[PDB]
Amino acid sequence: SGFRKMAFPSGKVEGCMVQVTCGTTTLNGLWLDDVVYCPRHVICTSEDMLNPNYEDLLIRKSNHNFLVQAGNVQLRVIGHSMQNCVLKLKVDTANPKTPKYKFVRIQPGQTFSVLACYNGSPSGVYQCAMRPNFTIKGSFLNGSCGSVGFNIDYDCVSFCYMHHMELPTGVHAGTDLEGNFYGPFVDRQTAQAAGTDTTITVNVLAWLYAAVINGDRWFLNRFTTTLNDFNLVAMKYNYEPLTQDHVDILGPLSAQTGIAVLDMCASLKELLQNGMNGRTILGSALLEDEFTPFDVVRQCSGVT
């Protein structure tokens, strides 16, 4: 028992982290097979960052301008291309610790682990969600760019995120591993504002299930509701709308607890309308939305 904000074990991703240096700029890359993936702004002076033309800036760069270091050994770059906002550096050595992997583009509400790195060395691991405004609320200092987000399915690392940017509000933006930004963000030192940071309703419901499963039951009410009635209250509280797809996904938690999804919805509705009254659920004073239904099931069943 107990329920913790839990990241994947990071070992498989630690074995992929390299330092990439172009001129004076150093950040992290992800070495998978004979390719190193890094943010393309590695080629930029922070003067360049104000209005970079990456294609033009790239003409000035050769294979040998990209310095790739894995531990304290340099990799030979024999190839470089730009894919969207990432650089793929072909190296002459396949990463011997390459895990089985996929590149996946996740949806808002999806959670993943970040291995925060500096000079290609891991400093820490935490669990995140893609916000409904396609930002993440990370922990990232200068040099953290190239750090990646991932899920693990048994032995397969699904890489879903690469860190690129801190917005003026101190929330984070980045790309999938094909270099396409989540949201409308661009790799340019220009004021860019996030949209409404809504609560991930399906993730709150999952976590209310995790709470019941772990003995925290004080908030279970005697009410039910409908998706439409629930959604009127959701909209009012900047909660994301709940779909039959969200209800479907919560079914297994519904089964294990004997609490119908719409009953748990009615409990959430009262928690929105009444607040916590100084109480806590799983040692939180606010409703947590960075556990997916899959996360709750995984942690509640001990998947490895």
Ligand X SMILES: *CC(=O)N1CCO[C@@H](c2ccc(F)cc2)C1
Residue with the two structure tokens 């940071």: 197
- 185 and 165 in contact (C-beta within 8 Å)? yes
Cα(20)–Cα(74) distance, rounded to whole angstroms? 10
Which of 52, 109, 138, 174 contacts a copy of itself by CB under 8 A? 138
Measured at the CA of 129, the angle between CA 173 and CA 287, to 5 degrees, comes to 130
Q: Contact between 142 and ligand X (CB under 6 A)? A: yes
List the catalytic residue out of 16, 41, 164, 172: 41
Q: Which partner in a copy of itself, ligand X, none is near 145 (CB below 5 to 8 A by kind)?
A: ligand X
| Residue 41 binds: one of a copy of itself, ligand X, none (C-beta under 5 to 8 A by kind) | ligand X
CB under 5 to 8 A by kind: which of a copy of itself, ligand X, none does 267 bind?
A: none
Nearer to a copy of itself, 261 or 271 (CB): 271
- Distance, in Å, from the CA atom of 114 to the CA atom of 172, rounded to the nearest integer, reads 12
Per CB under 6 A, the segment of 13-21, 62-70, 183-191, 265-273 that binds ligand X is: 183-191
Q: Which of residues 37-56 bind a copy of itself (CB under 8 A)?
A: none
279 touches a copy of itself (CB under 8 A): no
The two structure tokens encoding residue 180: 């396409």
State the nearest-atom distance from the C-beta of 17 to a copy of itself, in Å. 9
Nearest distance from C-beta of residue 138 to a copy of itself, angstroms: 5
What sign for the dihedral angle of Cα 81, 86, 87, 92? negative
Longest dimension (CA), the chain: 68
In order of 37, 157, 220, 268, 280, the CA distances from 215 in angstroms are 44, 33, 11, 17, 12
Task: Calculate the dihedral angle through the C-alpha atoms of 257, 258, 262, 268, rounding to the nearest 10 degrees.
Answer: -40
Amino acid in position 108: P
Of the pair 5, 188, the CB lying nearest a copy of itself is at: 5
Residues 282-301: x where in contact with a copy of itself by CB under 8 A, - otherwise, as a string = -xxxx-----------xxxx
Q: What is the dihedral of CA 285, 291, 294, 296, to 10 degrees?
A: -30
CB of 294 to a copy of itself, least distance (A): 13
Is residue 160 part of the annotated active site? The answer reads: no
Binding mask 90-129 for a copy of itself (x = CB under 8 A): ------------------------xxxxxx-xxxxxx-x-
Contacts of 280 (CB under 8 A, 6+ apart): 216
User: Site for ligand X (CB under 6 A): which residue of 75, 145, 208, 268?
Assistant: 145
CA dist., res. 14 & res. 255, Å (int): 37
Q: Amino acid letter at 259?
A: I
* 41 is known as an active-site residue: yes
Name which of 144 and 201 has its Cβ closer to a copy of itself: 144
Nearer to ligand X, 49 or 67 (CB): 49
Report the partner that residue 159 touches, choosing among ligand X, a copy of itself, none (CB closer than 5 to 8 A by kind).
none
- C-alpha–C-alpha distance, residues 272 and 236, integer Å: 10
- Residue 14 in the binding site for a copy of itself (CB under 8 A): yes
Q: Mapping DSSP to helix (H, G, I), strand (E, B) and coil, where does residue 291 land?
A: coil
Structure tokens at 113: 């682990």
* Binding interface with a copy of itself (CB under 8 A): 1-12, 14-15, 114-119, 121-126, 128, 137-141, 143-144, 166, 170-172, 214-215, 275-276, 278, 280, 283-286, 298-304
| Active site (catalytic) residues | 41, 145
